[PDB]
Amino acid sequence: FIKNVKFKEQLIDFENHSVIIETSMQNLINDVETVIKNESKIVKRVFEEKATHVIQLFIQRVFAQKIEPRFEVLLRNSLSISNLAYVRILHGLFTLFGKFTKSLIDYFQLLEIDDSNQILSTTLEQCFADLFSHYLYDRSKYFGIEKRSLEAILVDMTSKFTVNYDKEINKRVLLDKYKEKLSTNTASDIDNSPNSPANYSLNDVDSMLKCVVESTARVMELIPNKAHLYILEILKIMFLGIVDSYMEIALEVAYWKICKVDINKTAGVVNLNFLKFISMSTEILDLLSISIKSIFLPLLNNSPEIKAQIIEMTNSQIQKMEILINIILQETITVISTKFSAILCKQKKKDFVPKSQELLDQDTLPAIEIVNILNLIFEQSSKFLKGKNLQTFLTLIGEELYGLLLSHYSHFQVNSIGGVVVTKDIIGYQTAIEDWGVASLIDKFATLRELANLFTVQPELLESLTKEGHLADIGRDIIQSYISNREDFNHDNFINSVK
């Protein structure tokens, strides 16, 4: 009749089983263990049959004495504290029933009778299974309410993990209700880094892996062979917590960083969001992918419905979450692509619509908006961000910078000496986009560099400089008319070449 003393709880941290209290019935279990050896020797002498009634009615009087009163009292008190408290301490409580049960296995070996070493031993283990059966595995109390308090501690310690990232860095629509609800069917925070979430920083995935793989191990080793079903249940609750609450909540955190998608001349809230989604990729995708892979290799016992946890749970979260992040890297690719494309070509009618056919060959808003838009966009994080997408961030975001070179550098619409201003400002961006963090532009913006020396077709430098190597990035009949992308095309008979 204990009154649930402190403390109770001090045990709900992101770790294994924890602080007070004993057990204090392992006191009573040791007392029944040496009392068991005592009446074992005494009734071993003073009886005729052996299991009768020591194993028969005095093990029955043991659990009827102890496990009825003291252990259902312990369920009343441990459950009277909380649920996940008595879930983990039910794993420890019944694990202690397996401890003292194994002490009745070695203490059973202190006995020396074969039918007692038959299921009369497992009658004591069967009354241990009766103490199991008061909170039986056959109900959803021992597993599904253990999964329910595991969802309490799961959404508690995991959903509120990355606290200001989960709730909130957005409304949160955050392109998950906007882009994935449209395409697969903008300032949101500012401005440092992947700073809990992503992921967070793999430590929340070590927290959710810690407690969730902890109690997953606890109900795993604790419960009977009906385990792979609940392994798909709670593993699918990790598909809730990680493939949905950290691919689409704590990476909707990262998609609140990709709420700076469509970031045309808005590359400051995507100057801290390259590392945020890049570390969702690195920590969340790398850590959750290899950790869920090798952890899932242990978790699959022998079933072929376990392959439905391989393909449809895990690998379809790699293809589905691949559709999450890479399409948000397609619309984040539209954020950097609209950034350098719209913002870097946004020079006025003296640079990007220049008629300066014999002067103004220098740097301008092509250099300032190329180095500012791109080199403030991707040379802020994405130069040092994703190596988890190394050739994808560098070679593909820089390959879209080469696409942005086809929108800003090879699409700088300036005249016969303004093209030379593209040969000092967009060729002044060709090396600079190759240092802007999206840095694959040393060959196709360098094609826009020779095209920039081709886009300066005046009446003395129009034929063979436009007929250079990468000056065929100017048009096939628009080599001499390479400044037909300008106000004035090519200064008195642009089109005397194709015939």
Binding site: N16, L202, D206, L209, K210, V213, E214, A217, M220, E221, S281, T282, E283, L285, D286, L287, S289, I290, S291, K293, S294, I295, P298, K307, I310, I311, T314, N315, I318, Q319, E322, I325, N326, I327, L329, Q330, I333, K386, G387, K388, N389, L390, Q391, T392, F393, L396, I397
Partner: protein, 67 residues
């Protein structure tokens, strides 16, 4: 039912045995299903979570992610 989905069983089981008559004598006896990324103790599972922490620094972890 064990014709109505008996034959829906077996006509499925031959149909994929159609599609795994690939041009090798394909011999179809592996069963590995890998995603996009290639004990015997109590706390060894926690050592497996910490082995995923050993995987948290492994390798970079580098991959490709573009579209």
């Amino acid at each position: 039912f064990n014709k109505i989905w008996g034959k829906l069983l077996d006509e499925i089981e031959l149909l994929l045995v159609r599609y795994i008559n690939d041009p090798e004598l394909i011999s179809s006896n592996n069963g590995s299903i890998k995603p996009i990324n290639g004990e015997d103790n109590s706390s060894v599972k926690d050592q497996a979570f910490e082995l995923k922490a050993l995987l948290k620094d492994i390798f970079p972890g580098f991959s490709v992610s573009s579209n």
